[PDB]
């Protein structure tokens, strides 16, 4: 009785939200950006190849200096690379080799990682002893750790396969805020440039926008047909792009609270693993299961170029803060740095 | 053409690669086994005989084994099963005594049939096309006791065989191996274990060694 009545009210609210989004869908992003010229063909060459990982690379993250980057592989090794020289700065042996994510702190003093062990381990890079040591192990998730991102040296946000995201206090080792509401495994998260909001994509084919300080879900974005594997904020923080197993990328707007554009091709039938934007946000780079990375025109939904330099899945990619280069990691155990030439 | 500290940084990188090469050689000589099965199916008993993922290390006749238990994860299996692509073999545990039981959660699904659908997905999985399976049929002593009271007809309606233990045990093994839709790429090794058995480790070593040799014969091109 009461349960049946309440679940009918939820459907009425969903129809109200759907009507509200349709009301403000006066135009399409495609129509707005039809007049602007295309970016042309984007040609990028492999400037560097980072060798030394002996297993599938699952994650990488640039440091804020646009020169150092950390990559994670399931050979149980966290490696920090000097991208200019390809020198290995550190090699961090992981207690659990099943790592799925890695993060570089914006200060550059810490790195984080975690996987099937349900733990987010924090590593201190600047010690008087001259070696990298574990500074914190964040326990509390009951599923695998899928993504982690530092807010500062003391705060980090982690998403897990137990359908929840958490905000952690690194010094005390306790999760200050727990973000619940996803009905599937949360696979990725992206922090807003001001680090006051973050979006997460789960296996319920939905993306939720979370308030870090308040700790509740502000908006929910649907439209994908399969699990979302990747998510990335637009450089101004007013939009984000997702990548799913249905071979599509969608651009959602926070303020319009709805999908604006779909990035898919008929030849593409494989899942998407990673997404990122160029510094100006005009280019959307996505890694695919078909061993390639496709560069999309974010405004016009045109495939600008292809990064074909891997013999297995492109599992991760990232663009430097200065926008100079893009790194792609892959299951073939190699990392490559790409940029164009005049 | 490098500076004084640059030449020292390159030397540091070369030493890291030397240590990474050594760790890769050590890790490539270890046998990695993915342990699967259903809850309360004897899997815990197997580990003794030998909140995320539980790893067990043991050595048997100058061979190091890594056994990965992923039964404690309730997340989506398809989101992390590809991480084990490349293990030497999969150790699958099936409880024979659970043929007449009913799954506790579903309350209307046969427990034995729940293992078949789990086995069918793992055996036919795209990430384990070339990975052999070591099928352990646990609780054989309790299975014999249940045979006298509850016949096999409850589990298999289309079972015209005798109600003897040997005939009943062999029929269950055939059904599991018939779920293998690729009988050429992979092989299924079936062993009847028990709580008091002590030769389970030996069968794993024999099956793992058989997998390793047949992997070399594919590298050499003679097979």
């Amino acid at each position, epitope marked *: 009785s009461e349960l049946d009545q309440l679940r009918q009210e939820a459907e009425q609210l969903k129809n109200q939200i759907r009507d509200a989004r349709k009301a403000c869908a006066d135009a399409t992003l495609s129509q707005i950006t039809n007049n602007i010229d295309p970016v042309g063909r984007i040609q990028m060459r492999t400037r560097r190849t980072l060798r030394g990982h002996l297993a599938k690379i699952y994650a990488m993250h640039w440091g804020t200096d646009s*020169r*150092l980057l950390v990559s994670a592989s399931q050979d149980g090794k966290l490696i920090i690379w*000097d991208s200019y*020289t390809t*020198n290995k*700065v*550190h090699a961090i042996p992981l207690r659990s080799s099943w790592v799925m994510t890695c993060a570089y702190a914006p200060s550059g003093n810490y790195v984080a990682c975690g996987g099937l062990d349900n733990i987010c381990s924090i590593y201190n890079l*600047k010690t*008087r*002893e*001259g*070696n990298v040591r574990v500074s914190r192990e964040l326990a509390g998730h009951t599923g695998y750790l899928s993504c982690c991102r530092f807010l500062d040296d003391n705060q980090i946000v982690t998403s897990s396969g137990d359908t929840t995201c958490a905000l952690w206090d690194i010094e005390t080792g306790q999760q200050t805020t727990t973000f619940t509401g996803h009905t599937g495994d949360v696979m990725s998260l992206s922090l807003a440039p001001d680090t006051r909001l973050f979006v997460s994509g789960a296996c319920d084919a939905s993306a939720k926008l979370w308030d870090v300080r308040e700790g509740m879900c502000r908006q929910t974005f649907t439209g994908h047909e399969s699990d979302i594997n990747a998510i990335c904020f637009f450089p101004n923080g007013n939009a984000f792009a997702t990548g799913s197993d249905d071979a599509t990328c969608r651009l959602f707007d926070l303020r319009a609270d709805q999908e604006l554009m779909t990035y898919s091709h008929d030849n593409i039938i494989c899942g998407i693993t990673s997404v990122s934007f160029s510094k100006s946000g005009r280019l959307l780079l996505a890694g695919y299961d078909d061993f390639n990375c496709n560069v999309w025109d974010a405004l016009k939904a045109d495939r600008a170029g292809v990064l074909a330099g891997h013999d297995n899945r492109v599992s991760c990619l990232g663009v430097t803060d200065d926008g100079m280069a893009v790194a792609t990691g892959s299951w073939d155990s190699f990392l490559k740095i790409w940029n164009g030439s005049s | 053409t490098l*500076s*004084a*500290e*640059d*030449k*020292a*940084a390159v*030397e*540091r990188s070369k*030493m890291i690669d030397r240590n990474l090469r050594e760790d890769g050689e050590k890790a490539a000589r270890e046998v990695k086994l993915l342990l699967l099965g259903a809850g309360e199916s004897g899997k815990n008993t197997i580990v003794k005989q030998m909140t995320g993922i539980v790893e067990t290390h043991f050595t048997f006749k100058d061979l190091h084994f890594k056994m990965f238990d992923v039964g404690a994860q309730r997340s989506e299996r398809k989101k992390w099963i590809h991480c084990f692509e490349g293990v030497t073999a999969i150790i699958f545990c099936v409880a024979l005594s659970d043929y007449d039981l009913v799954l506790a959660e579903d309350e209307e699904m046969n427990r034995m049939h729940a293992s078949m659908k789990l086995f069918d997905s793992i055996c036919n999985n795209k990430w384990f096309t070339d990975t052999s399976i070591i099928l352990f049929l646990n609780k054989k002593d309790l299975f014999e006791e249940k045979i006298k009271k509850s016949p096999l007809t409850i589990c298999y309606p289309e079972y015209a065989g005798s109600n003897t233990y040997e005939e009943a045990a062999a029929y269950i093994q055939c059904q599991f191996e018939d779920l293998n839709k690729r009988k050429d790429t992979k092989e299924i090794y079936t062993h009847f274990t028990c709580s008091t058995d002590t030769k389970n480790v030996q069968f794993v070593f024999d099956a793992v060694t058989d997998v390793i040799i047949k992997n070399n014969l594919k590298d050499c091109g003679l097979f």
Partner: single-chain antibody
Amino acid sequence: DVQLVESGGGLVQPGGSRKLSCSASGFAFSSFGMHWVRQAPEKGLEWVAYISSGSGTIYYADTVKGRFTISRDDPKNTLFLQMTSLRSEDTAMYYCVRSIYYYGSSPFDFWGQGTTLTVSDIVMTQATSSVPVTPGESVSISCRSSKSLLHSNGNTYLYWFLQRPGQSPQLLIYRMSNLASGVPDRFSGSGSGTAFTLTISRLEAEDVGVYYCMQHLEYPLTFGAGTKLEL
């Protein structure tokens, strides 16, 4: 805590042999390159030898090459300096210095207390030998080099050290601008090409001492004469 204790020094006859030891505790010794630096009584610092991490690269100063042998024992965390044919010119306090080299590292960050031995090339210039100072006043120290210390990679390999009376040298500024860990922010390093300045805002009593500028562009590493601050 990070410690470097030297032993084996003492009075030796000319032409003799002596073995200096440097025991390391509190840090990953095998990961650090090691230098020996000596300081003649009432004189400046002089680099002696260098052994890299992994013992693959070894360098010597010209004045000691062929007579001194530097070695390390990574499992024992001990650094050695085998000396032969000791001359009266070798009478100095020998310091054990750790230095690690990677992108963004701070070489020469920790110095040992030193051991005393008594026997019976880019030129770095610090023309100002002494500077009278008063507490709370800003002081600038100048250093010059015969060659440009700016490399094509953008680094300027100039280091600043402070040797307080009775204490071992301490790193202040590495690569001409970066401030070493544990050093107050009042110290600032500024330079260009061959001319460098160390600015000390709001001088305090602890800052009193001798300041040395060292170049790390190439071997042999050379030190400046040193500028003394006195009240």
